[PDB]
């Protein structure tokens, strides 16, 4: 989930290609259920429709390559690189005050598409409100990357 070189992304680009035989760049259910069958297991079709739902965050029922990257990026990472999340804060905060507003958030989505509706953007910040303020701490972004 951090910065990678070309080679470290090239392998995950390769292993992604062994799923989607279309070359389209996305994995459907039947593009997935053949591979699980090839390694022996016969999952329930209702379970496989649930198994995509952990990976897919856009909710379009299909898996993108950065959707594929983050699954392997979560659970095999080290504990922390404390500077790199501190390096991440320079993009998420123009102010330098450490406090990430919803307006400072939508600046990044403006740079990267602004794919989601603003009510769903509002539902993001309601998770980070254990600070008792309604404002993103220096640590709120940190605990979201740990767990």
């Amino acid at each position: 989930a951090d910065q990678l070189t070309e080679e470290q992304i090239a392998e995950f680009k390769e292993a992604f290609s062994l799923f989607d035989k279309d070359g389209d760049g996305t994995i459907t259910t039947k593009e997935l259920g053949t591979v699980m069958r090839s390694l022996g297991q016969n999952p329930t079709e209702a379970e496989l429709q649930d198994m995509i739902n952990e990976v897919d965050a856009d909710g379009n029922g299909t898996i993108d390559f950065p959707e594929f990257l983050t699954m392997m990026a979560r659970k095999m990472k080290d504990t922390d690189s404390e500077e790199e999340i501190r390096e991440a804060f320079r993009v998420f905060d123009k102010d330098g005050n450490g406090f990430i507003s919803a307006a400072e958030l939508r600046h990044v989505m403006t740079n990267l598409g602004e794919k989601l509706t603003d009510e769903e953007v509002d539902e993001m910040i309601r998770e980070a409100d254990i600070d008792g303020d309604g404002q993103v701490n220096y640590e709120e972004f940190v605990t979201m990357m740990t767990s």
Binding site: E7, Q8, T70, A73, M76, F92
Partner: protein, 582 residues
Amino acid sequence: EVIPPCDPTADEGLFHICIAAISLVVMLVLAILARRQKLSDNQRGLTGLLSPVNFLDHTQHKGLAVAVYGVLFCKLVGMVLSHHPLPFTKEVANKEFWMILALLYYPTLYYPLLACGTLHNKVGYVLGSLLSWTHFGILVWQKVDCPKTPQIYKYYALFGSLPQIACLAFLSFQYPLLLFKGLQNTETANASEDLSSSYYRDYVKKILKKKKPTKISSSTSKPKLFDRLRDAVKSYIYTPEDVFRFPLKLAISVVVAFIALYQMALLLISGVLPTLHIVRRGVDENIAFLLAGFNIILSNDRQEVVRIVVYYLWCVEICYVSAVTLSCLVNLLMLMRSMVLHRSNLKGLYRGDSLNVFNCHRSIRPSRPALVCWMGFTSYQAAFLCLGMAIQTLVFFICILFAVFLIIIPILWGTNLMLFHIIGNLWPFWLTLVLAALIQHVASRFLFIRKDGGTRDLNNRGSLFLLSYILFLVNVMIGVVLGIWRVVITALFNIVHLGRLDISLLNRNVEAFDPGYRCYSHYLKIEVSQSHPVMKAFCGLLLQSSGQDNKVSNAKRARAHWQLLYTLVNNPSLVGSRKHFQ
């Protein structure tokens, strides 16, 4: 000169009947249990018999499969030498036809040995152990009595069976050893081949953690000719600390090659020295006098000719022993070298990188003739090594007599001086090939090539066009010395690397017609399209989390939407390949 009768051999015709009665039962028992377990793909898609041990697993224990192929190869070695070996109860039907189905007989016979490992229960290892006790029992009892055999050599079948004995002993220390591990309830586990070991998890872990050891150290410095004894260690290093495990089909092919090296090195030694000591004893100096007097000159003292002809048949025996020990050492050096290069070829084909990209720029696509090359890659490896030891010894034998009879003996003794009447009659001639090649290198670096500012070197022209014209007919005579070197250095390189598959002996532009390198790429292409150690670790997170697990899941989605952003910020070039591929 001795002939043993054998109560084992008189019972071996019934041990052919006995063991084949045992092997037919255990195969059909496993056909019953497959109709009692509702198995996966391990059943035959034509009849329903069990498959043997899965070859497309990288984490499966490879002690059984290396053992059984190590036995199946040795029976091929003994089958060529004995002309008869199986006429026993079936029809001959043009007897050379009866020397064919025995290729299909030994894998049928040893088939229940591998078949036990695919179940992991109390049924399999009890049936598995007793069979490995039995074949180890019959072979050892056949060799306690009657070691001396009149077939090839006085001790040949004893020395010929040394891998086949000790490789069954590994089966005897594995099936009871793995049965004893069933006390820890290792039989309630299942045949899930994607069982998420530490290997699959650490291999993905090595990719992502790599940025923290990516910070390099300094470089060391070693002086001359010990670094030369250390760069040779750098080709020796098969060791290094890595989370990397071979394919099963590749791991078999190294050991089965190593047994085949042991069998050719025994067949050459124990087939030639018997017909050499007999001549070294039975010299017949009275008859060899008339053998001398009919063709050549006695040249003195017919008693001393006994000292003469023996003093050469020392050197024939010394040469042919040295030729095998040279050729056995080189192929020992190559398979060690062929082990480290399978490592780097296979990681580089994970990346799709620019190492084996002479064909990896194309599509990974498991075609039809890619699959036939995979079916029987192990046989090609052990076949090309037996031809390796044949040719390499036949060549090196003629390359040492050319040294022993021409430079070694005359420096030692001084009888014949055939070359030093040739080189001694050209001693001013080869000076001028040196001095003209001296004057081309010397006058170039000191007069023509002018190193300037920025170390950029230009030339003082004009005078150089003259010198490349005065030396025109001289450089033809240098062009013959390089002509024979091109012929030689291609010959040595074609024999040293003759028993390797990972390397193409033809040109860069025509590699695909060399049949050895052709069957190696189509192996290594289908090995990565079936069991890549990232997608086989990927399904581990989708399987072992599914069996062990609203607005609350939207908070998980609210973490998931942020982790999409945290990746795309630190990875800019994926944003186009996200939005164009969303």
